[PDB]
């Protein structure tokens, strides 16, 4: 049922650090506008260098994050993300192309997809979250420069 569906998504979204304290009305907007994408082991969810305007929330499975760096021929494995975590916000906050690869590490991986407008009208609407995200993005820029990202 419609309401049972919204409830299952609402319960899951409340468990995401970034959305935990969001007001009910904005959480409802996320629930009405989100889309679901499934991936199999090895699939690229995001490719470094491509244009991107969507924010992702890992709803099932695990993915790996890889990045091209100076001195290396193959992208370096930066970290792994699991259910409840998110990615893709950097492109929206810096207004730039994707800065790393996100690859499905398991079969039947599932991500919740949120467009730029929705992201701006919800998360970007509260100064608390905006400030948190900017600070986090600033740290990522510093990690990139440290490992000599390409
Ligand atoms: N440049 C860079 N990106 C990183 C790094 N670690 C991650 S996982 C992650 C996700 C969310 C938070 Cl708050 C913190 C870490 N990412 C994600 O990869 C995405 C590629 O696409 P994008 O749109 O550039 O967003 C990027 C980020 O979300 C990193 O050390 N350097
Ligand atoms: Sr850049």
UniProtKB/Swiss-Prot annotation:
Record-listed 3',5'-cyclic GMP 2 binding positions: 79, 88-91, 98-99, 144, 147
Outcome after substituting residue 144 to A: Reduces cGMP binding affinity
Protein's cellular compartments: Apical cell membrane
Modified how: Myristoylation mediates membrane localization.
Subunit annotation: Interacts with GRIA1/GLUR1.
Family of this protein: Belongs to the protein kinase superfamily. AGC Ser/Thr protein kinase family. cGMP subfamily.
Functional note: Crucial regulator of intestinal secretion and bone growth. Phosphorylates and activates CFTR on the plasma membrane. Plays a key role in intestinal secretion by regulating cGMP-dependent translocation of CFTR in jejunum. Acts downstream of NMDAR to activate the plasma membrane accumulation of GRIA1/GLUR1 in synapse and increase synaptic plasticity. Acts as a regulator of gene expression and activator of the extracellular signal-regulated kinases MAPK3/ERK1 and MAPK1/ERK2 in mechanically stimulated osteoblasts.
Protein name: cGMP-dependent protein kinase 2
Organism this protein belongs to: Homo sapiens
């Amino acid at each position: 049922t419609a309401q049972a569906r919204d409830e299952q998504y609402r319960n899951f979204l409340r468990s995401v650090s970034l959305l935990k304290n969001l007001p009910e009305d904005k959480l409802t907007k996320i629930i009405d506008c989100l889309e679901v994408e499934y991936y199999d082991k090895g699939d690229y969810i995001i490719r470094e260098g491509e244009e991107g305007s969507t924010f992702f929330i890992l709803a099932k499975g695990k993915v790996k994050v890889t990045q091209s760096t100076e001195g290396h021929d193959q992208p370096q494995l930066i970290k792994t993300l699991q259910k409840g975590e998110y990615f893709g916000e950097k492109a929206l906050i810096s207004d730039d192309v994707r800065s790393a690869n996100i690859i499905a590490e398991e079969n039947d991986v599932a991500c919740l997809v949120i467009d730029r407008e929705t992201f701006n009208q919800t998360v970007g609407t509260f100064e608390e979250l905006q400030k948190y995200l900017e600070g986090y993005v600033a740290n990522l820029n510093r990690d990139d420069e440290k490992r000599h990202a390409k």
